[PDB]
Design a protein around this ligand. Structure first.
Ligand SMILES: [Cl-]
Lengths: 404, 401
């Protein structure tokens, strides 16, 4: 008898490495264990953190007794406008001229995917999307599933645990004209290594000269440094130089709306007419993917952005979150010197965001797990969110022991 | 030059165009029979009381907003499978299924289509009913499949072309994909009767077709969730390992929360595990993980006995409102003196009705009475209320007499 089914030939997918680390962490019986693979912000008690401004926004919304009817294909208009304003800045000529289209998406991933699908259909010049080495794990399958091809450019420098400026500029200067270049706006995931403003300026010059299309992923505006204007400076600089970028925004981190799935995709265009045509085709792409986006998170974000008192309170809360992460970076470096480490750990404080490439080797990572129950990925990436005032001393001691 | 000089403006949306034209009309007696969502008897959006209670239950728990798994909220997925398959389903007992949370029904359709594209080595063809939901074609086309058609609606009876459907399905190449609306066919409202479903199942099984069910109206269609899901359950009983796209947009009124689920019925639990792994691999690069608000609500309703009972009552009232408007339209048409057969209006199921009105009659209804509907004669029964059903019947009588 032929006992075949439809899916006999469907193989079991490979294990997710990051998930494996957190799963291993959960099983560990050591009371001193640390999870430096956690992929979301945690407070100084190591707990999930709902922003008070978000709670207050929820109360504002709940009192209005709103319906749950479908949003437009491109989402909540109020949210889209406010999202664009956050990214581009109040003084933006792009906003004043209306030479842009912003559509609400299923968080940052949704924005990346919609952007990729738009490129597949309309960016006829090339299929190649250049990603930094390394980049977010999901970037490759997003573009690949969308029907694009992936290339790489040097970014992280293993020798310094910093930015390979020379290597990056060299690689970008050799990217075929009219190719897509993906850039992390700030808080590079997973290294935390960001170009300095003067380095950004040089990159922009090459992008403009070689007629590259700049695709910005901005998942950490405000969360990175505590200053939303500073964090979005590179994006705004490119636009000022006449580079009509696209932009993927997430509110997962900076508003802690992880599971609500709140994001936006923006295309900066030549003029309002071009934006209208791009908008129509974006909607044509969105509708057969999920028809229209979720309401709850967009209402919360819109309420925060468009209510002055809430916006101010939110920006305060974001700064405190950014400062906690900066503080843990600073305390780790300080404690490492206290422990008597002679290794250069300046990269830990030079990096930005909740992900840090430590430079730890796989063998050292393995020892940290076995001996100290400190869990991180084999690449030596740590989630700074997993570090608190209570365990930063323990972490520094452990890192010293495995590197001394 | 610019990057997007060659990007052209998209074509006008016919459905939206009807609503837009309706909005502009200055006639105080105007009716929008193109509305694509439930409305109460006052023509207003309707949030279910059970949903409000669920929200209150959830708000009190002070829950976080952390990422769900790729496949969504586990308790929602399990409850959703149970709703579709029935509590005593052998599929549940054997565990030979995978259910993942999706971005409502559209999300489920697209995930299903993407799964077919990647793993359904047996065919590229997806057979849609004539007619079907407008979004079906682009979902499968964008996903990388080919579309075909089978006869479904009979314009001569405004009913189900059983003979034509069975004929067409019997000639579908073996191991093709067949899309079926579980109940409340959109846009016609014409459904196979149980006995007709049985013969369709026999042909599907004989021709070794893959049955892809779209179920957006369980409970909403007839007020009886078990009746509405009967065809899906029958196919499974007959050894057809279907997939299923569920939406909670209509039956819980969770439209904009985007609450849905995709279920694959599998040979065994092992197969389900492999399919699950690949579903997650497809989901993650689309949107990473699904929204938590609506799933928590649906889960709370389904898993709280009191809320579930109240919800099912509310669903019945909504279904009965639509049935009531169909009945009253036909009755009023009779009283107006119409000699035409309007039995199809009460035979059809769901909030969409193919009236059989010709394009010329549709135009007159717009011009003379400001009653707005699509040129195919489809009306949204949700646009009909106690206050306007008399006006509608008079108008239809005038244009058809
Ligand atoms: Cl344990």
């Amino acid at each position: 008898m032929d006992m075949s089914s439809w899916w006999t030939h469907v193989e079991m997918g490979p294990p997710d490495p990051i998930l494996g680390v957190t799963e291993a962490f959960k099983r560990d019986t050591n009371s001193k264990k640390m999870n430096l693979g956690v992929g979301a912000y945690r407070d100084d008690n190591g707990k999930p953190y709902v922003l008070p401004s978000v709670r207050k926004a929820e109360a504002q919304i709940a009192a209005k007794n709103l319906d749950k009817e479908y949003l437009p294909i491109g989402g909540l208009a109020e949210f889209c406008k406010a999202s664009a304003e956050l990214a581009l800045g109040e003084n933006s000529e792009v906003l004043k001229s209306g030479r842009f289209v912003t559509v609400q998406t299923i968080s940052g991933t949704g924005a990346l995917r919609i952007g990729a699908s738009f490129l597949q259909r309309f960016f006829k010049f090339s299929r190649d999307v250049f990603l930094p080495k390394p980049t977010w794990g999901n970037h490759t399958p997003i573009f690949r599933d969308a029907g694009m091809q992936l290339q790489g450019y040097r970014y992280y420098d293993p020798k310094t645990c910093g930015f390979d400026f020379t290597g990056a500029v060299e690689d970008i200067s050799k990217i075929p004209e009219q190719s897509v270049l993906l850039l992390h706006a700030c808080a590079h995931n997973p290294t935390g290594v960001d170009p300095r403003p003067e380095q950004w300026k040089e990159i922009a010059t090459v992008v403009k000269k070689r007629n590259l299309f700049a695709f910005f992923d901005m998942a950490y505006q405000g969360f990175a440094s505590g200053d939303g204007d500073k964090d979005a400076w590179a994006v705004r600089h490119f636009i000022e130089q006449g580079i009509n970028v696209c932009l993927c925004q997430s509110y997962a981190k900076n508003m802690g709306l992880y599971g609500e799935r709140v994001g936006a995709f923006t295309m900066v265009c030549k003029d309002a007419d071009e934006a209208k045509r791009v908008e129509s085709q974006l909607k044509i792409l969105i509708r057969p993917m999920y028809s229209n986006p979720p309401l709850n998170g967009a209402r919360i974000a819109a309420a925060i952005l468009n209510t002055p008192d809430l916006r101010k309170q939110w920006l305060q809360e974001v700064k405190v979150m950014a400062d906690r992460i900066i503080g843990m970076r600073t305390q780790l470096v300080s404690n490492l010197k206290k422990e008597g480490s002679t290794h250069n750990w300046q990269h830990i404080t030079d990096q930005i965001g909740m992900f840090c490439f430590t430079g730890l080797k796989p063998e050292q990572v393995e020892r940290l797990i076995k001996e100290f129950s400190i869990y991180m990925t084999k690449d030596g990436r740590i989630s700074v969110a997993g570090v608190t005032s209570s365990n930063v001393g323990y972490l520094a001691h452990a890192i010293h022991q495995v590197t001394k």
